[PDB]
Structure to design on (869 residues):
């Protein structure tokens, strides 16, 4: 009943290369230049084999410039998505244990949500896991740590029966050294019940825990595995296409064209004298293997001698191709990079804002749904209320909220069109209030003469 | 009605059926996953005392025969498999045909298939060799054509004795199955009807599982012999140790940058009631070292406790 | 010729896929699925289908 | 068993007619109709009556 652990599903095998390339792009210039062989082909292989060719390749790659717009693309998208903070719907006094320190490390649920959203926006995969300790912890499983899942149909229902993921840990001896523990977690769903097996894997050994089925506060065990996999497209175990693939490909093409451009700049950038129509007699008589080119000094030339200060000219077609790449990346990513030259008409951009925020809207909902489901499972563990919600900031392109908008929202609160908490969340999101609602209330019933 | 494919699904993955593990063969072949240190893993259990019950004479007890108790030792040998370094070629099949770069994925698929195949084949070969060393083999090559539909299995039952119930599967090559099909399809003794000529079991409640492993076939032309060996509850144990490693390494010095893929893993073999003689064998045995008899000691006192029996048919 | 297929790979590996269709369907779906669809009818009875 | 009186499965006559039967698997034989159908009707004059062809 326990077989073939530490086996990775072959769809993930097809996707590891893309994931690794995307992680390299996120790392920056150093990762790309470390593996320039994969991205930048050698211009001449016959020289490349020879030792005089490999040094040329190194010098070729060092001069190259990595744009690294993909990292900014991801950082900017995480920017508007997490403006202010996500809203939590439900009791707060009995849910502080998950909000303040979601995994027991003192790390707030907001920071783990930020990490998960960045992970699911860069390479479009991630996982959440909740397990009882007494307090449940909402774990976070990276895209590469999830490595096996199953989907069979029991009573005609899409069910995730098997799911295995890997976790890394360092055992603590009395020394100061660092060791690694590749603890795996086996999740199974037999006859509509949830069971899980852990593999101790003691430092220097491999040991396995016995079977056990976590149960809720009242009992009844479970009917679905408390592991949700969120992606750019949706929340299904199936692999989703990473949103950064095309931008990374464009960035790599721009990088290799930048390598070509920088080599050309190093070679032919400097102007060259090009003394033509010259004779060795004239050289050894007057020049003497040395030419003075300053303004104060002149040089003589024989009859029918033409000096041509020749150099590579600007607007090289390689640079034109690089400009095409920059424009093409601008066309794809919303705000990977900015442009001071261009001017945008206001109101026309509002039409296309919804389409430009398509990925942002999806990622937000996919993460919001995943975290809401994880919190509901945690409540089931603790026997709290089930009607709770953790909904991210689906509003993007945020900014200080206008005085006219301020009067509008105040008037809407005077009428019965916006709830008090909705108006508070509005005025907070607009950068006009910072205190919590209860503090504002308890100071509002105070009879200040002013 | 499925013919249209995805891309590169046509890449051949395997031709021999290897779905012969755990519940597939009624628990005959156990494929667990547990780590174990060293090239050997042995477990010791008490031996069965031979002269426990003796005749006694109360009239004159006279002298008393001395007795003592021993401790048999089982075994689980560890084998190490691997993969030859695989070149990762540039896509040069591009006259008109296409050529991808998913070498890692293709190697992963083929490697999973062949890993399953290799453990299954090594387990079958070790089981056959061990049972032959234990004497639980019935050679049927001279009687008639060489294989009978059902009367041959009775010989294996007679070998295994009073515990005949403990056998509930018959791993076999495809040729013996087709011979059963042909003889059944020509019922010289009328016990089949057209609706029952496709029986897979052996008329004793034991299903016959079919695979074309080279371990169950040998020889050619008139020397061709097929082994159809039956199992017991968890007779052959295969324990993979979770030590898979793989690298991709480039090379410098040749006309092209030579890319490589190399993998390594290990697993453990154990046949019920049998111990691998490491002294006559070796620390890390070859697949042909497992198939060699006299390297397999018979630990269990009785053949019944030892799990399995081999039937040899041409 | 084999040098021909080598030339073809040199020609292809240098190419750039714009990928405008993926961004197109992304924007199209985004425009359609802004906010969320509105459900008409009882909800406490249909919650098992919505969830 | 699919019955077909196709002349591709008889190949002979008298005492040397050799019927051939095929055991096929899923997607064994693939036929694609390339939808390049072209049909022309051409007519001629200069006779007592108009002549057409297809």
């Amino acid at each position: 009943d326990s077989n073939n652990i530490k086996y990775v599903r072959e769809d993930a095998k097809k996707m590891h290369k893309l994931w690794a390339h995307i992680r390299m792009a996120m790392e920056g210039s150093r990762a790309i230049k470390d593996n320039a062989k994969e991205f930048v082909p050698h211009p001449d292989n016959t020289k490349a084999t020879t030792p005089e060719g490999v040094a040329r390749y190194k010098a070729y790659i060092e001069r190259a410039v990595w744009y690294g717009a993909s990292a900014n693309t991801v950082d900017g998208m995480l920017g508007q998505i997490f403006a202010r903070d996500p809203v939590f719907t439900g009791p707060e006094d009995k849910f502080d244990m998950l909000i303040n320190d979601v995994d027991g490390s003192g790390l707030s649920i907001h920071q783990q949500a930020r990490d998960s959203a960045e992970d699911a926006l860069s390479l479009g995969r991630g996982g959440l896991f909740v397990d009882y300790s007494a307090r449940p912890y909402i774990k976070f499983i990276a895209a590469e740590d999830i490595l096996n899942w199953r989907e069979r149909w029991v009573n005609g229902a899409k069910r995730t029966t098997l799911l295995v993921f890997r976790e890394e840990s360092d055992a603590d001896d009395d020394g100061y050294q660092i060791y690694k523990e590749e603890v795996w977690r086996e999740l199974r769903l037999v006859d509509g019940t949830y069971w899980q097996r852990t593999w101790r894997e003691n430092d220097g050994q491999l040991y396995v825990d016995d079977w056990i089925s976590p149960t809720k506060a009242d009992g009844s065990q479970f009917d679905e595995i408390p592991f949700v996999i969120f992606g750019s497209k949706n929340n299904d175990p199936t692999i989703d296409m990473p949103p950064m693939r095309d931008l990374v490909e464009l960035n790599i093409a721009h990088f290799r064209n930048s390598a070509d451009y920088e080599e050309a700049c190093f070679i032919c950038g400097q102007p060259t004298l090009f003394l033509s129509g010259l004779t060795e007699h004239w050289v050894k008589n007057v020049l003497g293997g040395a030419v003075v080119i300053g303004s104060r000094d002149a040089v003589p030339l024989p009859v029918n001698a033409k000096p041509e200060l020749l150099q590579a000219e600007g607007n090289g077609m390689v640079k034109e191709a690089m400009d095409q790449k920059e424009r093409q990346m601008v066309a794809l990513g919303a705000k990977l990079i900015d442009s001071d030259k261009t001017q945008r008409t206001f109101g026309e951009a509002s039409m296309e804002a919804a389409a430009q925020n398509s990925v942002l809207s999806r990622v937000s909902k996919n993460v919001s749904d995943a975290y809401t489901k994880a919190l509901r499972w945690a409540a089931m563990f603790l026997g709290l209320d089930e009607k709770i919600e953790y909904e991210l900031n689906s509003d993007f392109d945020i900014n200080k909220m206008s005085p006219e908008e301020l009067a509008a929202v105040i008037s809407a609160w005077q009428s019965n069109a916006i709830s008090f908490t909705e108006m508070r969340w509005q005025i907070k999101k607009g950068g006009r209030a910072y205190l919590e609602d209860e503090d504002m209330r308890n100071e509002s019933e105070q009879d200040d003469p002013l | 009605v499925f013919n249209d494919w995805a891309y590169k699904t046509m890449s051949e993955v395997l031709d021999q059926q290897v779905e012969l593990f755990n519940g597939a063969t009624r628990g005959a072949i156990i494929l667990r996953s547990a780590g174990n240190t060293g090239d050997l893993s042995e477990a010791a259990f008490w031996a069965k005392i031979q002269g426990l019950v003796r005749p006694r004479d109360p009239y004159s007890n006279a002298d008393v025969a001395a007795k003592d108790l021993r401790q048999l030792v089982d075994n689980t040998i560890k084998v190490a498999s691997g993969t030859p370094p695989i070149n990762i070629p540039p896509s040069m099949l591009r006259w008109i045909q296409k050529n991808p770069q998913e070498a890692g994925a293709v190697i992963g698929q083929q490697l999973a298939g062949d890993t399953m195949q290799d453990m299954l084949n090594n387990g079958l070969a070790a089981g056959k060799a061990a049972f032959t060393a234990g004497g639980a083999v019935h050679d049927i090559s001279a009687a008639g054509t060489g294989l009978m539909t059902q009367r041959a299995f009775n010989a294996a039952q007679r070998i295994f004795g009073d515990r005949s119930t403990d056998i509930q599967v018959w791993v076999s090559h495809s040729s013996p199955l087709f011979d059963l099909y042909d003889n059944a399809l020509a019922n010289a003794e009328q016990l089949y009807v057209f609706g029952t000529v496709n029986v897979r079991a052996d008329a004793f409640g034991r299903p016959i599982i079919i695979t074309d492993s080279p371990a169950l076939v040998s020889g050619a032309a008139e020397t061709l012999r097929h082994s159809t060996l039956g199992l017991t509850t968890g007779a052959i144990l295969i324990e993979q140790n979770q030590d898979f490693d793989s690298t991709v390494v480039d090379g410098t010095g040749k006309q092209n940058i030579t890319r490589q893929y190399q993998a390594e893993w290990s697993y453990n073999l154990g046949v019920n009631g049998y111990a691998y003689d490491i002294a006559t064998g070796g620390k890390a045995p070859n697949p042909t070292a497992l198939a060699t008899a006299a390297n397999w000691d018979k630990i269990s006192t009785s053949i019944k406790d030892t799990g399995g029996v081999v039937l040899v048919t041409k």
Notes: Residues 42 and 50 of chain C are 11 Å apart (CA to CA).
